[model samples]
Target chain A: SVQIVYKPVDLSKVTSKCGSLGNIHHKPGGGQVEVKSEKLDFKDRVQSKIGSLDNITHVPGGGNKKIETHKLTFRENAKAKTDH
Target chain B: SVQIVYKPVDLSKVTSKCGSLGNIHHKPGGGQVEVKSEKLDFKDRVQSKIGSLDNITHVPGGGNKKIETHKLTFRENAKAKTDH
Candidate 1:
């Protein structure tokens, strides 16, 4: 399966112009399905990317555990993003 | 190296009873150091769990390429949390 590679307008944030952009783009009229898909896709990607980190809270009790002897690493979800 | 495994109160949310907890915990006064470590550790864990997802935004331009052929899964950052 081929992944989406065509980048579109950056709509990470929205304002009064936001609705205008959606309307202009969906002007084609047959975009009802795509609109729904877009919303779900955004959430899917967000949770998929941002919710994979786990190595603590799972077992740690409070502060009674040893921390000084711990060695860990962390990286921000790189693929996580905003709107179209 | 052993990681800190002590789990404390579930502070995912806070209210008027919040300050009291912090005060009680820090009553020892020597907690200034652990407090610093705790703050850093929290951020560290958050990023570690939430920032590891990446496989789309890196390439996808506007999503014009393909999407229907995709099959993915997502799980919220299980370890990511709020307060102590």
Candidate 2:
């Protein structure tokens, strides 16, 4: 079993918004499933891209782990879509 | 393998607040893990209670599934602490 440890986040004070902009598009009907999948894919892509970049340094056991480490920092937004 | 299907929830419109009243208590330093675990436990307890109640009728494959179905309806708040 792989043990995953994450940094603590303050759920009550953490706040964010989904916006429509250059690369960000807000879907009015987008539900939890959509949001979860999108966020998961986004995080994975970011990790993959960063990991590939790290490969250039050729550090032992470095590249992918660094990217994975970054991915672990993300927390599921607990206050999503509560704003009108 | 058992399959679980859930109704879609509009994440962008779902909003809730943590409070200290009745059975709800807000924790300032609470993080994702704490929130997730607490929510999970709450859901389980509710399902269990409902299932026990349904047991009185003793409908075939009824009691527990009814409660379980209810539990599946809950979604994590995605915009929880975004308010200032």
Candidate 3:
């Protein structure tokens, strides 16, 4: 198993073109589930790549006992597929 | 190092009353950063608990090479603070 830092994502301002990138369900104080997709945007569907996971850490108590942290890393640099 | 499983969250219909639970910034094919918070709702701020991570898996090729998977786990069960 590999251990890395996890980051947090702004749920309200996700720039995903698709209505949803995936689905998640949790059982408070239990476990969770996730459904993923490969749609780049509302129209342009592309392949998925190894998006790095950042800020993976844990903290002590808010209500429960311990809490883990993570966030999504987007790719906006490189070439923007420009057309002339 | 504890590598369990990762889950994916639906960025569309997140029931978080708060505008955001955290923030995420990606660097295309690089890395990312996140800012976490503890605001349960838009007004009623509570604490964060130990939410579990599920479906920690990855895939190969879409455009780059390999891809990682993850999602948010929401707690909707237990007591919903209902009054009569």
Give the fraction of native contacts in model 1: 0.04
- Provide the overall lDDT of each model, using Cα atoms, as 2-decimal numbers: 0.21, 0.21, 0.29
Residue range B1-84, candidate 2, lDDT tens digits: 333333333222223232211121223242221101112122221312111100011112101111111122222344433433
Regions of candidate 3 where Cα sits further than 4 Å from its true position = A4-10, A13-84, B13-84
Task: List model 3's recovered fraction of native interface contacts, to 2 decimals.
Answer: 0.03
Model 2 lDDT, full chain set = 0.21
Model 3, A1-84: lDDT tens per residue?
A: 444344433344222122211222211442323323332222233323222322332311111121334444332233223333
lDDT of 1 at B13: 21
Per-residue lDDT over A1-84 for candidate 2, one digit per residue giving the tens place of the 0 to 100 score: 223333333232223222211121122232221101112122121312111101011112101111111222223335343333
In the range B1-84, model 1's lDDT, one tens digit per residue, is 323232222222211111111111112222111101122123222322322311111111111111112222222243433443
The CA root-mean-square deviation of candidate 3, after full C-alpha superposition on the true structure, stands at 32.8
**Superposed model 2: Cα runs more than 4 Å off:** A1-84, B1-3, B6-69, B80-84
Instruction: Indicate the DockQ of the complex predicted as candidate 3.
Output: 0.02
TM-score quality measure for candidate 2: 0.10
Distance from true position, residue A12, model 2, in Å?
42
- Candidate 3 structure lDDT: 0.29
